Write a protein that binds this DNA or RNA. Structure first.
Ligand SMILES: CN[C@@H]1[C@H](O[C@H]2[C@H](O[C@H]3[C@H](O)[C@@H](O)[C@H](NC(=N)N)[C@@H](O)[C@@H]3NC(=N)N)O[C@@H](C)[C@]2(O)C=O)O[C@@H](CO)[C@H](O)[C@H]1O
Ligand SMILES: [K+]
Ligand SMILES: [K+]
Ligand SMILES: [K+]
Ligand SMILES: [K+]
Ligand SMILES: [Mg+2]
Ligand SMILES: [Mg+2]
Ligand SMILES: [Mg+2]
Ligand SMILES: [Mg+2]
Ligand SMILES: [Mg+2]
Ligand SMILES: [Mg+2]
Ligand SMILES: [Mg+2]
Ligand SMILES: [Mg+2]
Ligand SMILES: [Mg+2]
Ligand SMILES: [Mg+2]
Ligand SMILES: [Mg+2]
Ligand SMILES: [Mg+2]
Ligand SMILES: [Mg+2]
Ligand SMILES: [Mg+2]
Ligand SMILES: [Mg+2]
Ligand SMILES: [Mg+2]
Ligand SMILES: [Mg+2]
Ligand SMILES: [Mg+2]
Ligand SMILES: [Mg+2]
Ligand SMILES: [Mg+2]
Ligand SMILES: [Mg+2]
Ligand SMILES: [Mg+2]
Ligand SMILES: [Mg+2]
Ligand SMILES: [Mg+2]
Lengths: 132, 117, 208, 316
RNA sequence: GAUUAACCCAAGUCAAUAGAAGCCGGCGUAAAGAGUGUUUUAGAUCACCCCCUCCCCAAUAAAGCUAAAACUCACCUGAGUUGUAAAAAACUCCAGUUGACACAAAAUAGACUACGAAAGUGGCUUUAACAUAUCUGAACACACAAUAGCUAAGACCCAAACUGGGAUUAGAUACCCCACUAUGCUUAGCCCUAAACCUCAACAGUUAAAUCAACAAAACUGCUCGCCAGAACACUACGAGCCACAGCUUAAAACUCAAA
RNA sequence: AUAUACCGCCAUCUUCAGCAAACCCUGAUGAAGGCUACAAAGUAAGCGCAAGUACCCACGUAAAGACGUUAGGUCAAGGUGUAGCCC
C-alpha cells in the first residue's frame, strides 16, 4: 500500500498538522506549495539550482533554530530576493531570535549572492489540526 | 393429531426402552427452511420429436417438414414467456403459502421459549 | 459507458412519429409525452433514416470487417449484391419464356432468404454429467441461429480452399447455392442436424 | 485525553459576531467602498483578490463568512439548573423526531372523528437540519409513510401547510432545444447559424431559409469533400427526417478531427440551425431521434500499467 | 562457562536417597452401573397402618395353516435378455403373457407404543402360559443371552464372506457389474461374545433451598449392592477354569512419558 | 554479512468493506458475544469507503483505498542498528 507522506492512524494521541495531515494527492487541491519560484514553469530554466537551495535552506534553518520550528518553511522568491517565512515557538528568548535573524540573513546573503530576509511568526504551541 | 411423545425418549422416569433417538432436540426453531429449487419440466418435446422424425424421412429438408417446425417454433415462444411470467409472478404474487423470508418475520415475533424468564 | 443510465436509445423510425394523434392509443400516447422528459443518445453513424437501410446487411458487414475498415467491408457487400444482380440478369436473358417467372433478380430477397435456409433449429451444447461432457441437443434461440447463419457463410468464404478468388465472387456464389438449398453452408446445417437427431437419447441431461 | 470535540458556546459565537462586523468595516476601507452597502458577495470578491488561492477545493480557500454559516448548529443545553429536561420526550433520545411523529399521528385521529409534479419529499440529510437530530434511514421512511397517509385522507387546510414544509422543490429544465435567432444578410436572405462538436471536430453551419439543396464544406461541394457515401448519408439525415430535402442552402466550415468526426459535427450543426425553420413539434422529433444531442463519446486515456485504455498486458 | 555484584542459610552448606502429610470423593460423555434375572448368609426401614391402571395390543414354546412375490415345468408367441454415470463379461432349453406350484421370508395397519428379565418380539388359528403381599442381594452358584461360528443330518426361492471372471486404476488383493459357495432356515448338541449403549444400577421419595462447571436427557435426598483412583503397555503375559484348542472369562508388572 | 533489526518507498488480498478508541450490557463477572423497524442491548469520536476534487458534466476514467495478512520485496537509491575488514 501507498506510504508516501502519510501519517498512519493511531489510538488518537498523536497530533498532526494540516500539511502533515494531507497526503500527496491533495498537494494542489487542499495544500499549496512550500516553495514558489518560476523554475518549473514552461520555458523557464534553473529549476535544479533553485531546488538545491531549498534543500539546504530547510536544513540550515532546522539546525540553526533547534526545537523552535513549529511547521515547515515557506520559501518565496521575487526576483533577486529570497523570503523565508517561518512559524516558531515562543520558548526561546527574543534576544536569541534577533541574533539568529541577523546571522542567518547575512550568512545566506553572502553564500547565495542575493538579498535574504527572514520573517518569523511566533506561536505559543504547535497548532494542531486533528489527532490521528 | 400430532403423534404422542409419552415414553418415547430415554429418560429417568421412563422404565421402558426408548422409542425415538433424535439427534436434534425436539424443540421448535424460530425459522423455517428455504424452499428448494425444482428440477423443472422440459417443454416442446412432443413437437421436437415429430419434427426430427420428419427430417429422417425427408433427409433433413426444411421444405417438406414446414408444418412440423412451426409447432416446435410456436411452442418455444409460448414456453419462453411462461418461464419469464412464472419466475417474477410467484415471488411478487401472493398465492397459497407464504415465502420463508416473510414467514420468518412472523415466527420471530412469537419466538419459542424453551427457557424460563 | 460515457452515457448515464438516464439516456435512452433513439428511435430512427421516420413513419412512427408521423402517426396521427388520432391513431395513438392511450398507452402509446403516454409514452410519447414521457420521451420528451427523457434524455436521448446521439444516433450512431451506422444507421440512418434512409429507405434502403437494411439491418441484416449492416450486421453482416460488421461481422466481416477487420480492424475497423468499414469502407472495405461495405465495398465487398455492395460488390456481392451487384454480382448477384448481374449473374441473375445473365440467367434471365438466356432463360425460356416460362423460366423467367421463377428467377429472382433482387439481391436483397436472395440475401435474406439464403440466410434463412441456413438457420439451424437445434444445436449441440456440452453438458457436464458424471465427470464427462455430452453434446446434448439444445434448442437454439432465434438470435443464435440468425448469428450462426452469418458466421458460417463468412467462415466458408474465408476458408482457404479457393486459391485466388475475390470475396465478392465467393460470397455471391455461396449465396446463390444456399438460395437453392445447396452448398456446404446448408450441408453444415444438416451435419449439425444429423448429430442432434442421433444423440437425442441424451436430451434429458439438460435441465433448462 | 488530548482530542476533544471543539464545542462552541453561545458566548463564544457572540464574540465572533462582533469581530466579523468590525472586520467587515475594515475590508471596506481597504477597497474604498461604503461600509453600509457592503454585501457578502463583495467580501467574497475582495478576499479572492487579496488572498488569491488556486486550490481546486473551494472549501479549502480563504473564507470570511458570518459565524452562523461557518460554525455548525449544536444541540443546545437540554435541561435547567434543577436538571429537569424541558421536553417531555427527552429520555427517548430523539425528542424532536418523536414529537413530530406524535403530532402527525394526532392529526390523523381527528380526521376520522369529524369524518404532484415539481415537488419532492424532504431528503434525509435535509430532515436532520430541521430537527438537529441524527436519523436512520428506516426512521425517515416511517415518517414519510405517515405523511403520505395524511395526504390520502381528506386533510384540512391547516394540514396542507404542515405537509408542505416537508415537500422540497425541484427545478426541472424543460427538454426543449434553444432556437437560434434568424438573421438577415446584406442581400436580405434569412439564415440561422449554429455550432457542433464530435470527438475533436468542431463545425459551424449556416442554413439559409430558401435554397436549392447546395452544401459547401470549407468552400468545396460536399460530394467532393466527402467521397465516402456514409458521410453524405449523415448530411442527408437531418433534412430527410423533416422531409425537406432540396429546400435550403448550407455553407459550413469544419475543422479538426477525421473523416467521420467532421460529418457528425456538421450534422449536429445543421440540425440545430434547421430547428429555426421548422415547427416546435418537429424539433421535438429531432431531439427524440438523436439529432440535437452532442455525442459525449471521446477517446479514453491509456493507463501507465496497461497496454491500452482498458486492455491489460498479458498475464503470465 | 568465566568474571563482578547480590540473595539465602551459616561452621556448615545441600547433590543423591529414604521417610514423614493420603480412604466419608466419585461412576450419562473424563477412570468406574461390569449383558439379564433369581436366591443364599446377611443387611436395610422404603415392610402393619395407608390408598389409585387386574384383563386386552407385536412375551415364550409346540402343532397346523397361507395372501403377495419368486423358482421350476408346460403351452402360445417373439429374437434377444441381463447390466449402467457409462461399458464389458455373462446367459441365449433365453424373454413376455397365462396356468399350476415352498421346510424361504412375513406390505399396509404402525401417525400405535404394547409384551417380555434382558436378548428380543409386528402374517393366521388353537393349546399351555407370563415368579413373588417389604426392599436389596453374585464375572465364578442356578438359569437364560442378537449376529457370527463349530459338529452331525436334512432343505434350498433369494441373498451372500471366500473364490473365479469383467472393468476402473500409476497399482486395486477395494469401491461398480456377473456367477457361485460356506452361511442365514429346520432338528439335536455346543460356543457364551456386542457401541449386549436408553453408555444414565435396584427400591422408596421430593420439587423447596445455594437451580446448576460445560454439553447431554433439570437438580437433589434416603438406603443398599457392584465397580473405579494419571496415560500407555493391556479386550495383553503367566496362572486357573471351561464340550470352548487361532477360543472365552478373570487379569498384572517391568521398561517409558509429563502429560493423556 | 544480516531485508529474519529497521526507517524509507512499494506489491498483494483491495475488481474488498471493513477498522477502532472510550463506555455500556449479556453469559452466575469463562474464553467469548452483542440483531429482528409492528424492533428483542447496544451507543460511538476517529481511520477507511462514501462524499468532494482532476479530466470533456450528474456518466465514465484516473486518483484514493484503513487495519491487518504473506518475518512478501529491496542493506546494491540513500540512510541506518548489530557483527566484521583497516598494507
Ligand atoms: C508444556 N509442555 C508441552 C509438552 O512438552 C514436553 C514434550 O514431552 C514429550 C516428551 O519429551 C517425549 O519423550 C514424549 N515421547 C514419548 N514417546 N512418550 C512425548 O510424548 C512428550 N510430549 C507430550 N506428552 N505432549 O517435549 C518435552 C521436551 C517437553 O517440552 C517437556 O516439558 O508437550 C509438547 C508437545 O509434545 C508441547 O509442545 C509443550 O508445550
Ligand atoms: K446407545
Ligand atoms: K519493509
Ligand atoms: K546496513
Ligand atoms: K541501503
Ligand atoms: Mg447425535
Ligand atoms: Mg488497441
Ligand atoms: Mg469412561
Ligand atoms: Mg447397563
Ligand atoms: Mg461387556
Ligand atoms: Mg406379513
Ligand atoms: Mg433380589
Ligand atoms: Mg463379587
Ligand atoms: Mg461377562
Ligand atoms: Mg448365543
Ligand atoms: Mg448356526
Ligand atoms: Mg443366488
Ligand atoms: Mg478381481
Ligand atoms: Mg448354500
Ligand atoms: Mg441392543
Ligand atoms: Mg443391582
Ligand atoms: Mg492406568
Ligand atoms: Mg472381546
Ligand atoms: Mg487372553
Ligand atoms: Mg493362559
Ligand atoms: Mg520484508
Ligand atoms: Mg465521478
Ligand atoms: Mg488505480
Ligand atoms: Mg473517493
Amino acid at each position: 500500500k501507498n506510504r508516501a507522506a502519510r501519517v498512519r492512524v493511531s489510538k488518537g494521541d498523536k497530533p498532526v498538522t494540516y500539511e502533515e495531515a494531507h497526503a500527496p494527492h491533495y498537494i494542489a487541491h487542499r495544500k499549496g506549495w512550500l516553495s514558489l519560484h518560476t523554475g518549473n514553469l514552461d520555458g523557464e530554466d534553473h529549476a535544479a539550482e533553485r531546488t538545491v537551495e531549498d534543500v539546504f535552506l530547510r536544513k540550515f534553518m532546522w539546525g540553526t533554530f533547534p526545537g523552535c520550528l513549529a511547521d515547515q518553511l515557506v520559501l518565496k522568491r521575487r526576483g533577486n530576493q529570497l523570503e523565508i517565512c517561518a512559524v516558531v515557538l515562543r520558548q526561546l528568548s527574543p534576544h536569541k531570535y534577533y541574533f539568529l535573524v541577523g546571522y542567518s540573513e547575512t550568512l545566506l546573503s553572502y553564500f547565495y549572492k542575493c538579498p535574504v530576509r527572514l520573517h518569523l511568526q511566533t506561536v505559543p504551541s504547535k497548532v494542531v489540526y486533528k489527532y490521528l | 393429531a400430532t403423534p404422542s411423545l409419552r415414553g418415547r425418549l430415554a429418560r429417568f422416569g421412563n422404565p421402558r426402552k426408548p422409542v425415538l433417538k433424535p439427534n436434534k432436540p425436539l424443540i421448535l426453531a424460530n425459522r423455517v427452511g428455504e424452499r428448494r429449487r425444482e428440477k423443472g419440466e422440459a417443454t416442446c418435446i412432443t413437437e421436437m420429436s415429430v419434427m426430427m422424425a420428419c427430417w429422417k424421412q425427408n433427409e433433413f429438408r426444411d421444405d417438406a417438414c414446414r408444418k412440423e417446425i412451426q409447432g416446435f417454433l410456436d411452442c418455444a415462444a409460448r414456453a419462453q414467456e411462461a418461464r419469464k411470467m412464472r419466475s417474477i409472478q410467484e415471488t411478487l404474487g401472493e398465492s397459497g403459502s407464504l415465502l420463508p423470508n416473510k414467514l420468518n418475520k412472523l415466527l420471530q415475533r412469537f419466538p419459542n421459549k424453551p427457557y424460563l424468564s | 459507458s460515457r452515457y448515464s443510465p438516464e439516456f435512452k436509445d433513439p428511435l430512427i423510425d421516420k413513419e412512427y412519429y408521423r402517426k396521427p394523434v388520432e391513431e395513438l392509443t392511450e398507452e402509446e400516447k403516454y409514452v410519447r409525452e414521457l420521451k420528451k422528459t427523457q434524455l436521448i443518445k446521439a444516433a450512431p453513424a451506422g444507421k440512418t433514416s434512409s429507405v434502403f437501410e437494411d439491418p441484416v446487411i449492416s450486421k453482416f458487414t460488421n461481422m466481416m470487417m477487420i480492424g475497423g475498415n468499414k469502407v472495405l467491408a461495405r465495398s465487398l457487400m455492395i460488390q456481392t449484391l451487384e454480382a448477384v444482380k448481374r449473374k441473375q440478369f445473365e440467367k434471365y436473358h438466356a432463360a425460356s419464356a416460362e423460366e423467367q417467372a421463377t428467377i429472382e433478380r433482387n439481391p436483397y430477397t436472395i440475401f435474406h432468404q439464403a440466410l434463412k435456409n441456413c438457420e439451424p433449429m437445434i444445436g449441440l451444447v456440452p453438458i457436464l454429467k458424471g465427470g464427462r461432457f455430452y453434446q446434448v441437443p439444445v434448442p437454439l434461440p432465434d438470435r443464435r441461429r440468425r448469428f450462426l447463419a452469418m458466421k458460417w457463410m463468412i467462415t466458408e468464404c474465408r476458408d482457404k480452399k479457393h486459391q485466388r478468388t475475390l470475396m465478392p465472387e465467393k460470397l455471391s456464389h455461396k449465396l446463390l447455392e444456399a438460395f437453392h438449398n445447396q452448398g456446404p453452408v446448408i450441408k453444415r446445417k444438416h451435419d449439425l442436424h444429423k448429430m442432434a437427431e442421433a444423440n437425442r437419447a441424451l436430451a434429458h441431461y439438460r435441465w433448462w | 485525553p488530548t482530542s476533544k470535540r471543539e464545542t462552541y458556546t453561545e458566548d463564544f459565537i457572540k464574540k465572533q459576531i462582533e469581530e466579523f462586523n468590525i472586520g467587515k468595516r475594515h475590508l471596506a476601507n481597504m477597497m474604498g467602498e461604503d461600509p453600509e452597502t457592503f454585501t457578502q458577495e463583495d467580501i467574497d470578491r475582495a478576499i479572492a483578490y487579496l488572498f488569491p488561492s488556486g486550490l481546486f477545493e473551494k472549501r479549502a480557500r480563504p473564507v470570511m463568512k458570518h459565524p452562523e454559516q461557518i460554525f455548525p448548529r449544536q444541540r443546545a443545553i437540554q435541561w435547567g439548573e434543577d436538571g429537569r429536561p424541558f421536553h417531555y420526550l427527552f429520555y427517548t433520545g430523539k425528542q424532536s423526531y418523536y414529537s413530530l411523529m406524535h403530532d402527525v399521528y394526532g392529526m390523523l385521529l381527528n380526521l376520522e372523528k369529524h369524518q404532484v409534479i415539481g415537488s419532492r419529499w424532504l431528503i434525509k440529510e435535509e430532515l436532520e437540519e430541521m430537527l438537529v437530530e441524527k436519523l436512520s434511514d428506516l426512521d425517515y421512511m416511517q415518517f414519510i409513510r405517515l405523511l403520505e397517509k395524511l395526504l390520502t385522507s381528506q386533510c384540512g387546510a391547516a394540514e396542507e401547510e404542515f405537509v408542505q414544509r416537508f415537500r422540497r422543490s425541484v427545478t426541472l429544465e424543460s427538454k426543449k432545444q434553444l432556437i437560434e435567432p434568424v438573421q438577415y444578410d446584406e442581400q436580405g436572405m434569412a439564415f440561422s447559424k449554429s455550432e457542433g462538436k464530435r470527438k475533436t471536430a468542431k463545425a459551424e453551419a449556416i442554413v439559409y431559409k430558401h435554397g436549392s439543396g447546395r452544401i459547401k464544406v470549407n468552400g468545396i461541394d460536399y460530394q467532393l469533400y466527402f467521397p465516402i457515401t456514409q458521410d453524405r448519408e449523415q448530411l442527408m439525415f437531418p433534412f430527410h427526417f423533416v422531409d425537406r430535402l432540396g429546400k435550403h442552402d448550407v455553407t459550413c466550415t469544419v475543422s479538426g478531427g477525421g473523416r467521420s468526426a467532421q460529418a457528425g459535427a456538421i450534422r449536429l450543426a445543421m440540425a440545430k440551425a434547421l430547428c429555426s425553420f421548422v415547427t416546435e413539434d418537429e424539433v421535438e422529433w429531432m431531439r427524440q431521434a438523436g439529432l440535437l444531442t452532442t455525442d459525449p463519446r471521446v477517446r479514453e486515456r491509456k493507463k501507465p500499467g496497461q497496454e491500452g485504455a482498458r486492455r491489460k498486458f498479458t498475464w503470465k
